[PDB]
């Protein structure tokens, strides 16, 4: 009733249950549907569901699932001096961490549930979106090590590609994921 | 401590509510001071660079002036010049804090 | 107004009128700086860059009295014919301010 | 909790929820901008937050402070637009472009 | 019993009484009598005593009472900031508001019931004191937005006149009030 999480009903429920999916009101006010906070939510069924993942989703799936959790922890880590200092006024690595966390939030986690083909999302499609975002980060980081500036890698036609890759029908996504991976590797070899 | 009644529970809820508003108030104050700090830092580096350009001018002129003439003529001249005193520091009272800004007196044309 | 910058090129600052001192030894320059913050030399001391990076810490130790003697790192002349590294100087000033390597 | 089903197309007017949310956010920061102004002043502001302070100080004297006169939904919405016209054009972020282009000023 | 007004007796009294008056104890440790707490006391009869006030006291008496209550509300709003940040890091206008609220609570609210004068204070004297303090406040805020120092405002010989204006008798009071209004224009004429 008071919105506080120390009453014995919530306390006894969080002792009993195995997954807690903390909805917040602030994310819906920032227009992020589903409004589920990832910084307070927690599940305990990952380690039990790892061999099912390796036999039915893909072999390397928990490692890049851990990578996405690492990125969304570093973003909310350095968020304080994001607010204090400025958006662009960080360094070349930390602002790229900000932008890959932002493309995670507005491309992977955010989901228009009323849409025709955005509502349902299987494991192969989530693995594909995850591998696109992580390949973007793991090549843009060495790219900003080698020779490029932070604005030349952002504005690029793989960003609209990744950003609209969730609007792909489930049969079409195998005939789209490989082309997107080829073109992100080509657009990072060319100049980036 | 305080002897707990139903009055002091609401008094401590009121004190907590005031401190929870004060944290956000001081974060807004820190944001305004960040804005003014990034205001002044580019003006400081601009004035520093202008000081560097006038430094190149003055050092080249001083080397060439002690060069074409002797060192002793500019030595006796520099030991002849009045000490240009009375330079002092007056008020910039802001944030309730007087910082001393500096102005000179400059006997120059005489 | 006083300077501790150079052995001989402080004579140009004396030729400006404003007084000063030069020693080319760090500790006698700091000792004349000490009698210059005791006998306050009219509120400005300009200290050489590549002899004293931070002149202010020893002076605020030996005088917790107020900052009427202002202390500046003034440029050495020889390094002035190289380039000021204005950017890196403001980097170290901002990192002396808030610790962060944030770049405006 | 039951305003979404109450106002809108054919219920009162189409701009109703957007006027509501925009007035709520503008008064929400117009309150604590007075808390900021308490320790800083009226010259070390922006122009934007100064204009928000004037919006809050006229909001709580023309919109809330009704008295016992009778206000319809039409006159209340046009007083709401006349108060929102104190804000700068384009800062009305939670309103779509047509209602701004039709009812401003 | 416990000094706490959440009792079953007090919460059954304050739903049927009008004009409920909390006496606190922290305004009673320092001897500030009567110790009426203003943050939590109320009176509901102010909307049916308007025509009686407007005939038998003055004409602008409800607006002057509302000016007092609005200024004390701004004072008790800024007491947050003065308990958090400090008395400095505040502007000159809000320091004016805090000082004028303090001289209201020391020169209009405080009243000792043992002195010969200032026990029975009929409301002509109370209207006089409020009109003194509001004329002081309005011309002080006009002077402080023109721009003078606040320490050359708060060291006048006229707010001592306001502070002693409640120890003077009822009998010769309106001539003293006229002299106080003449000095209250002639002390901000000079600045």
Curated annotation (Swiss-Prot), chain A:
Coiled coil: none annotated. Produces ATP from ADP in the presence of a proton gradient across the membrane. The V-type alpha chain is a catalytic subunit. Belongs to the ATPase alpha/beta chains family. This is V-type ATP synthase alpha chain. The gene is atpA.
UniProtKB/Swiss-Prot annotation, chain B:
Belongs to the V-ATPase D subunit family. Produces ATP from ADP in the presence of a proton gradient across the membrane. This is V-type ATP synthase subunit D. It comes from Thermus thermophilus (strain ATCC 27634 / DSM 579 / HB8). The lineage of its organism: Bacteria, Thermotogati, Deinococcota, Deinococci, Thermales. The gene is atpD. The chain holds residues 3 to 112 of 223 of the full protein.
Curated annotation (Swiss-Prot), chain C:
The keyword Transport applies. The keyword Ion transport applies. GO terms for molecular function: ATP binding; proton-transporting ATP synthase activity, rotational mechanism; proton-transporting ATPase activity, rotational mechanism. It comes from the Bacteria. Keywords: ATP synthesis, Hydrogen ion transport, Ion transport, Transport. It holds the Pfam family ATP-synt_F. Coiled coil: none annotated. One of its GO terms (biological process) is proton motive force-driven plasma membrane ATP synthesis. Belongs to the V-ATPase F subunit family. Produces ATP from ADP in the presence of a proton gradient across the membrane. This is V-type ATP synthase subunit F. It comes from Thermus thermophilus (strain ATCC 27634 / DSM 579 / HB8). The gene is atpF.
Curated annotation (Swiss-Prot), chain D:
It comes from the Bacteria. Produces ATP from ADP in the presence of a proton gradient across the membrane. The V-type beta chain is a regulatory subunit. Belongs to the ATPase alpha/beta chains family. This is V-type ATP synthase beta chain. It comes from Thermus thermophilus (strain ATCC 27634 / DSM 579 / HB8). The chain holds residues 360 to 464 of 478 of the full protein.
């Amino acid at each position: 009733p008071g919105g506080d999480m120390s009453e014995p009903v919530t306390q006894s429920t969080l002792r009993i249950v195995g997954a807690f999916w903390r909805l917040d009101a602030s994310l819906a006010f920032r227009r992020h549907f589903p409004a589920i906070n990832w910084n307070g939510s927690y599940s305990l069924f990952t380690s039990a569901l790892d061999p099912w993942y390796r036999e039915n989703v893909a072999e390397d799936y928990p490692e890049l699932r851990d990578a996405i959790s690492e990125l969304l922890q570093r973003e909310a880590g350095l968020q304080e001096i994001v607010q204090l200092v400025g958006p662009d006024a960080l360094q070349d690595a930390e602002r790229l961490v900000i932008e890959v966390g932002r493309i995670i939030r507005e491309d992977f986690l955010q989901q228009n549930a009323y849409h025709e083909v955005d509502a349902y999302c299987s494991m192969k499609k989530a693995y594909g979106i995850m591998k696109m975002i992580l390949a973007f980060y793991k090549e843009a980081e060495a790219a900003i090590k080698r020779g490029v500036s932070i604005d030349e890698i952002l504005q690029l036609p793989v960003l609209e590609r990744i950003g609209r890759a969730r609007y792909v029908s489930e049969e079409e996504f195998p005939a789209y994921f490989e082309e997107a991976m080829k073109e992100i590797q080509g657009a990072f070899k060319a100049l980036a | 401590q305080v002897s707990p009644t139903r009055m002091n529970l609401l008094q401590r809820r009121g004190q907590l509510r005031l401190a929870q508003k004060g944290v956000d108030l001081l974060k807004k104050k820190r944001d305004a001071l960040v804005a003014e700090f990034f205001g002044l830092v580019r003006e400081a580096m601009e004035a520093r660079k202008a000081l560097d350009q006038a430094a190149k001018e003055a050092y080249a002129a001083l080397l060439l002036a002690q060069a074409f003439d002797g060192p002793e003529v500019v030595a006796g001249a520099a030991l002849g010049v009045p000490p240009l005193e009375g330079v002092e520091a007056e008020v910039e009272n802001v944030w309730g804090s007087k910082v001393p800004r500096l102005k000179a007196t400059f006997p120059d044309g005489a | 107004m006083a300077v501790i910058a150079d052995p001989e090129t402080a004579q140009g600052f004396r030729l400006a009128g404003l007084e000063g001192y030069g020693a080319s030894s760090a500790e006698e320059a700091q000792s004349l700086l000490e009698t210059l913050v005791e006998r306050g030399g009219y509120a400005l001391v300009a200290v050489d860059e590549a002899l004293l990076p931070d002149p202010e810490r020893a002076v605020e130790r030996l005088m917790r009295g107020r900052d009427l003697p202002v202390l500046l790192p003034i440029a050495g002349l020889k390094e002035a014919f190289q380039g000021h590294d204005v950017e890196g100087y403001m980097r170290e000033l901002v990192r002396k301010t808030i610790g962060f390597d944030i770049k405006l | 909790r039951l305003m979404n089903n109450g106002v809108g197309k054919g219920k009162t007017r189409e701009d109703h929820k957007q006027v509501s949310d925009q007035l709520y956010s503008a008064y929400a920061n117009g309150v604590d901008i007075r808390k900021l102004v308490a320790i800083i002043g009226e010259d070390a502001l922006t122009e934007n937050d100064r204009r928000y302070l004037q919006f809050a100080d006229a909001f709580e004297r023309f919109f809330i402070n009704q008295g016992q006169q009778n206000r319809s939904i039409e006159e209340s919405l046009q007083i709401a637009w006349a108060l929102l016209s104190m804000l700068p054009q384009g800062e009305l972020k939670r309103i779509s472009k047509d209602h701004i282009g039709k009812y401003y000023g």
